């Protein structure tokens, strides 16, 4: 569905970055939107979820204080906005659709369409 | 699949139900809604019924009785320039009323149409007026009037009125153009017995309308796309006079005619009425045969109130005679007579006395549609013969209420969803 | 936004964000009397039956009793997407009474597990 | 049945609130038999909901028994009397009880409007 | 215990304190449409507080922010210095655009919760 990151990838310890998604080959406010972590050797982990309305999100533990999900159906855009950066954070982010759906559609708890991912480097 | 009960409450479904409606003197589109509507078995139009029965029992009752009438009473032949036509359906009356005080009378004359009177043998009298044996007449107040003002029908909190906005609907089946409306448009409480006055007309062609096509007990209401000018009159300038016949009770009666008498005629163009009757044909032809050569014919003998068409004019009661119409094998005038004692409702025991209005009394009323009622015997031919004919004046109000349904909302109901409590 | 019954045509899941447009119309001479004390009765009804069920003051009331699929074997796709609400009460009919008494009894049990649970000290 | 449970004990009585309610609510002493019924609901449904209890059929409150109003214990109360009983013996402290549950309501929302001011 | 309208020439902080009072005074022909005209009033105030998720409290907080077109005043102004009276007079007008935010206010939050109660 050609999801694709449009975000920064350089920031120092201790500053702020921006990551976004836009998508075109699917209905945008008819999924839940995720971010999800791959650390380089470490495997994947997931990092925040954001319901298809966007009046819901939710996140791991160790980035609830720092990080904030938002969505904008309109222009089918997805933000994520990281606060507060820590070396343990440099990894590749990658958007993914679904996760999770309302009580109206069938369950989902799973990703599907991953994007291409953001690299994001903490010096 | 893990689902658990979800209730909901706002949910738009209804059911079909009658109730109450309010008398009152938006549109909301509904997409993708097919109804089902069925203009017989609507019971908008029993109760627009029994209204206008209220109503009109109510409005006579704080009114002039005439039981100080009722009398014998000595008619003559009218002496003025009466033409052929007006013999006989003219008599000047006289009788020996009431006044305010209960130990004194008064001679007293009158001019009344011959069917108010009914002959009886008796000495110095030779007439009596109809419903004297039977029923009761009351007069209706002056201060009143018959003019059809609109009136619209809402339904209560909880309901909903559908509207059929088929161009081509012919009052039952499917609908697929569906509107929710509170309140209906103003519909005119306007009495006829034989064409349908002031109504709504059809946006395309002419749409005829029958319980059961097929079956000569039904009526078929026909409602034309265009109107059809009917224009009458009255050309006699009467002067009306009154009396009081009792502790301020006052009677109107028709007291001269200033000039000439005449008939009361109304005329229905020639180069209108033609060719409607052929779009009337025309769309009758989608039901029966089209080998089928269909005939008109003037309705048979009866009551007055069922052969003749009795519109309202002013505050007089014409009842034309429409032999002049439906007459043919597919400028017309015809004779308009009067009355003054009215059973209005076919019914006895509550005889209205319609007085006399001043001056002269000419109307111009739309034709927007008619009543058939076929052969009656189905002759098994090709020359299916059409009588115009009345009914007990509910359709006249089916014809305005043939695209009203009147639903219960229900709004509450359950579905499955993922949300389990707790 | 679409009127009091505009979303009557459309999906489930469509006419479900329009509830609060026809829940104001619900509420807004002795015949006249008699209907408005119908229209009331009607009402009162409805809120007493979501009452029994504890989902008094919501709209949209979640609870705990599971969708048997011998009222309606459809997925969530099929009901809410390509359903209408007037379809789908038709074809439920002959199963809200039993729908209504589980609701009922659920709502039972629920008040007597939460008294006792407010009961432990 | 409706009423059936009258002759019951409380603790069993207390199970069919479900039975006894939905009879509460179904030419001018029709319609003022009506317009009475609908009332009287109303003013129960009202006294309900200024007391937190909008909405249930069984309502726990903060407000302590007192042992004046009556000193039996829960086993006799619930297993060995009758609602029509019970209602007799406490009906002349009924109005105070009334009144402490209102008062325990007016306090309650204050607090909880204080909670959600943090 | 100042009775019905006692505390209406009261503060707005004070006069909140007899919610209950107000609430309890609310509830052959002409007899009959004023009672049911009665019923009709306190019915629709009731079923418009339940719409905005408030049914069974008199004292109902809310997630709508407050406006500074509305009154551009303070809590100390508002609540210890004026009358519920005065303050109504103030806000006249401007009620229909609060009751709608708080209508799409609750109706945003009603599918929240079941978002919520949906995740297994
Ligand atoms: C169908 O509609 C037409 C037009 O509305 C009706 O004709 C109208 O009838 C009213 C009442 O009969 C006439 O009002 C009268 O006006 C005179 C004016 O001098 C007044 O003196 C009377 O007291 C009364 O107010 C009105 O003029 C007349 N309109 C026209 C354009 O002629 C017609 O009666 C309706 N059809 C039926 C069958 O009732
Ligand atoms: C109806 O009859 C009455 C009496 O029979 C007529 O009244 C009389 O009319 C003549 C004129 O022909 C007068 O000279 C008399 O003085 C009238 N008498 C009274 C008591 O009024 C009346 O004119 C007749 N009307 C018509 C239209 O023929
Ligand atoms: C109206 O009443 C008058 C009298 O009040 C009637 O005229 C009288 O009729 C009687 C009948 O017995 C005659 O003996 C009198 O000679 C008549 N009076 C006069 C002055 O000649 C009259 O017949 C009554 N008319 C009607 C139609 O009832
Ligand atoms: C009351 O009088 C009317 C006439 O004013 C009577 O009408 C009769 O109707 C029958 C048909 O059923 C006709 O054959 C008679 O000729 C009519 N009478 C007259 C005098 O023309 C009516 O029958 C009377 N009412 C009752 C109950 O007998
Ligand atoms: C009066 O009118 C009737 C109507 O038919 C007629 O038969 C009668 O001869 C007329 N009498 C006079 C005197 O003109
Ligand atoms: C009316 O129209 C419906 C449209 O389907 C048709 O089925 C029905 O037979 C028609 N009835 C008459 C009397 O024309
Ligand atoms: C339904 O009627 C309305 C009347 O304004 C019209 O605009 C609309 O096009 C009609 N729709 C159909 C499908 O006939
Ligand atoms: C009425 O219907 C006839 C049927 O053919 C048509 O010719 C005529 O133009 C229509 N008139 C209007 C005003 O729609
Ligand atoms: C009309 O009535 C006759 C009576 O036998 C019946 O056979 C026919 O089917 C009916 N038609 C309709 C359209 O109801
Ligand atoms: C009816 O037509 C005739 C024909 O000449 C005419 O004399 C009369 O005045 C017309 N009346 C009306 C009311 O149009
Ligand atoms: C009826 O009278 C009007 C005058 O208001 C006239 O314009 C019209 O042509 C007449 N129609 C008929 C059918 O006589
Ligand atoms: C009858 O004639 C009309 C005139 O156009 C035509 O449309 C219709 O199909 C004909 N009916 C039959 C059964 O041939
Ligand atoms: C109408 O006039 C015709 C003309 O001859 C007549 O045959 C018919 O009986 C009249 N109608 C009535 C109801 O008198
Ligand atoms: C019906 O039309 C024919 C056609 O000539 C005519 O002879 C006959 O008199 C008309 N009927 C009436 C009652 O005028
Ligand atoms: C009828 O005659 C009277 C005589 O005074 C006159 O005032 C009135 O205007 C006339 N009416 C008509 C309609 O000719
Ligand atoms: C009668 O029809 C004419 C034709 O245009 C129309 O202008 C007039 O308003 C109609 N009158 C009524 C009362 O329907
Ligand atoms: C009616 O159905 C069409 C199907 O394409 C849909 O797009 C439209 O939104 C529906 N109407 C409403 C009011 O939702
Ligand atoms: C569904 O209804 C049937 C009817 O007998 C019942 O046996 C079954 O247990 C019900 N399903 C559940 C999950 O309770
Ligand atoms: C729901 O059921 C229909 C009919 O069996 C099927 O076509 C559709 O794919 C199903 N959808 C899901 C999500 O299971
Ligand atoms: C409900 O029962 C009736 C009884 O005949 C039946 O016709 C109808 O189809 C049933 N409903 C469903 C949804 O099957
Ligand atoms: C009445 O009392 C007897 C005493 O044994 C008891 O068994 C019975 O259940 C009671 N009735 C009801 C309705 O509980
Ligand atoms: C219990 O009631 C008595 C009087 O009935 C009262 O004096 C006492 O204070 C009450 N108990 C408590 C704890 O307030
Ligand atoms: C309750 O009080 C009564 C006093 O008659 C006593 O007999 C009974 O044993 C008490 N119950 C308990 C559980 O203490
Ligand atoms: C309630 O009070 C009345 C008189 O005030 C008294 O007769 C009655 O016995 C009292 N009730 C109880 C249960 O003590
Ligand atoms: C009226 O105003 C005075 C001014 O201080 C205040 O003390 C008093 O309490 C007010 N009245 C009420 C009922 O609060
Ligand atoms: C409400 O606040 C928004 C910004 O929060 C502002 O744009 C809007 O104009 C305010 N409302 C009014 C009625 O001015
Ligand atoms: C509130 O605003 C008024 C307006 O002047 C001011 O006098 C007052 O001190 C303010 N109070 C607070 C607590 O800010
Ligand atoms: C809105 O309310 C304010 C409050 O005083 C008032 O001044 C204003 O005139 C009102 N708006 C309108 C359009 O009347």
């Known amino acids: 569905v050609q999801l694709v990151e449009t975000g920064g990838g350089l920031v120092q310890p201790g500053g702020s970055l921006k990551l976004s998604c836009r998508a075109s080959?699917?209905?945008?406010?008819?999924?839940?939107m995720s971010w999800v972590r791959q650390a380089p050797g470490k495997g994947l982990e997931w990092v925040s979820l954001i319901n298809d309305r966007g009046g819901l999100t939710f996140y791991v533990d160790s980035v609830k204080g720092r990080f904030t999900i938002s969505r904008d159906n309109s222009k089918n855009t997805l933000s994520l906005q990281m606060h507060s950066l820590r070396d343990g954070d440099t990894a590749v982010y990658y958007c993914?659709?679904?996760?999770?759906?309302?009580?109206?559609?069938?369950?989902?708890?799973?990703?599907?369409?991953w994007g291409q991912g953001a690299l994001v480097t903490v010096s | 699949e893990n689902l658990w009960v979800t209730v909901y409450y706002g949910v738009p479904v209804w059911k079909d139900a009658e109730t109450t409606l309010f008398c009152a003197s938006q549109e909301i589109h509904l997409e993708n809604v097919t109804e089902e509507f069925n203009m017989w078995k609507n019971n908008m139009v029993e109760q627009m019924h029994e209204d206008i029965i209220s109503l009109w029992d109510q409005s006579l009752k704080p009114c002039v009785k005439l039981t100080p009438l009722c009398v014998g009473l000595q008619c003559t032949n009218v002496t003025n320039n009466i033409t052929d036509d007006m013999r006989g359906e003219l008599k000047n009356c006289s009788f020996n009323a009431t006044t305010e005080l209960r130990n004194k009378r008064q001679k007293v004359y009158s001019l009344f149409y011959r069917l108010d009177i009914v002959p009886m043998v008796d000495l110095w009298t030779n007439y009596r007026l109809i419903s004297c044996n039977t029923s009761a007449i009351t007069q209706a107040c002056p201060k009143v009037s018959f003019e059809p003002i609109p009136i619209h029908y809402c339904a209560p909190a909880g309901f909903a009125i559908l509207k059929c906005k088929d161009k081509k609907f012919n009052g039952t089946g499917p609908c697929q153009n569906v509107s929710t409306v509170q309140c209906t448009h103003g519909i005119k409480p306007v009495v006829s017995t034989q064409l349908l006055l002031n109504g709504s007309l059809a946006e395309e062609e002419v749409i005829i309308r029958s319980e059961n096509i097929t079956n000569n007990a039904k009526n078929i209401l026909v409602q034309l796309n265009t109107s059809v000018q009917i224009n009458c009159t009255r050309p006699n300038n009467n002067t009306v006079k009154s009396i009081r016949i009792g502790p301020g009770q006052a009677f109107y009666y028709t007291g001269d005619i200033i000039g000439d008498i005449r008939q009361a005629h109304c005329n229905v163009s020639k180069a209108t009425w033609n060719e409607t009757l052929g779009k009337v044909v025309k769309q009758l032809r989608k039901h029966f045969g089209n080998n089928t050569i269909i005939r008109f014919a003037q309705s048979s003998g009866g009551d007055l109130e069922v052969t003749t068409h009795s519109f309202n004019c002013g505050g007089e009661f014409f009842y034309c005679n429409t032999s002049g119409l439906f007459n043919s094998t597919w400028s017309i005038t015809l004779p308009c007579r009067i009355k003054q004692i009215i059973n209005m409702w076919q019914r006895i025991g509550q005889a209205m006395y319609a007085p006399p209005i001043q001056g002269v009394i000419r109307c111009v009323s739309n034709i927007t549609g008619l009543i058939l009622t076929r052969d009656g015997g189905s002759t098994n031919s090709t020359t299916e013969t059409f009588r115009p004919g009345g009914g007990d004046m509910r359709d006249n109000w089916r014809s305005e209420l043939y695209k009203y349904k009147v639903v219960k909302i229900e709004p509450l109901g359950v579905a499955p969803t993922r949300c389990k409590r707790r | 936004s679409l009127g009091f019954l505009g979303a009557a045509g459309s999906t489930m899941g469509a006419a479900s964000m329009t509830l609060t447009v026809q829940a104001r119309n619900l509420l807004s001479g002795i015949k006249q009397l008699q209907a408005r004390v119908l229209a009331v009765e009607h009402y009162l009804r409805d809120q007493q039956l979501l009452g029994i069920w504890g989902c008094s003051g919501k709209l949209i009331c979640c609870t705990n009793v599971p969708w048997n699929s011998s009222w309606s074997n459809r997925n969530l796709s099929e009901i809410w997407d390509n359903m209408t609400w007037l379809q789908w009460d038709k074809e439920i009919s002959n199963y809200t009474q039993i729908i209504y008494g589980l609701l009922e009894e659920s709502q039972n049990q629920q008040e007597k597990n939460e008294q006792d649970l407010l009961a432990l000290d | 049945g409706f009423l059936g449970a009258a002759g019951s004990t409380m603790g069993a009585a207390s199970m069919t609130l479900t039975v006894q309610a939905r009879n509460l609510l179904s030419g001018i002493k029709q319609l003022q038999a009506r317009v009475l019924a609908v009332e009287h609901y109303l003013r129960d449904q009202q006294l309900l909901g200024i007391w937190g209890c909008s909405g249930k059929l069984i309502c726990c409150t903060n407000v302590p028994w007192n042992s004046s109003w009556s000193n039996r214990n829960l086993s006799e109360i619930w297993d060995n009397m009758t609602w029509l009983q019970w209602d007799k013996e406490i009906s002349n402290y009924t109005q105070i009880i009334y009144g402490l549950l209102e008062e325990s309501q007016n306090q309650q929302e204050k607090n909880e409007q204080d909670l959600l001011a943090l | 215990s100042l009775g019905f309208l006692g505390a209406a020439g009261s503060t707005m902080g004070a006069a909140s304190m007899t919610l209950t009072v107000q609430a309890r005074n609310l509830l052959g022909i002409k007899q009959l449409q004023a009672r049911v005209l009665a019923v009709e009033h306190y019915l629709r105030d009731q079923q418009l507080l339940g719409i905005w998720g408030c049914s069974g409290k008199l004292i109902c907080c809310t997630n709508v922010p407050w406006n500074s077109s509305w009154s551009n005043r303070n809590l100390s102004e508002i609540w210890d210095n004026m009358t519920w009276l005065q303050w109504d007079k103030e806000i006249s007008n401007y009620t229909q655009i609060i009751y709608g935010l708080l209508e799409e206010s609750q109706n945003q939050q009603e599918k929240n919760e079941q978002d919520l109660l949906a995740l297994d």
């Open positions: 993914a659709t679904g996760g999770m759906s309302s009580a109206l559609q069938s369950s989902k708890y799973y990703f599907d369409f």
């Open positions: 080959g699917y209905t945008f406010s008819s999924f839940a």
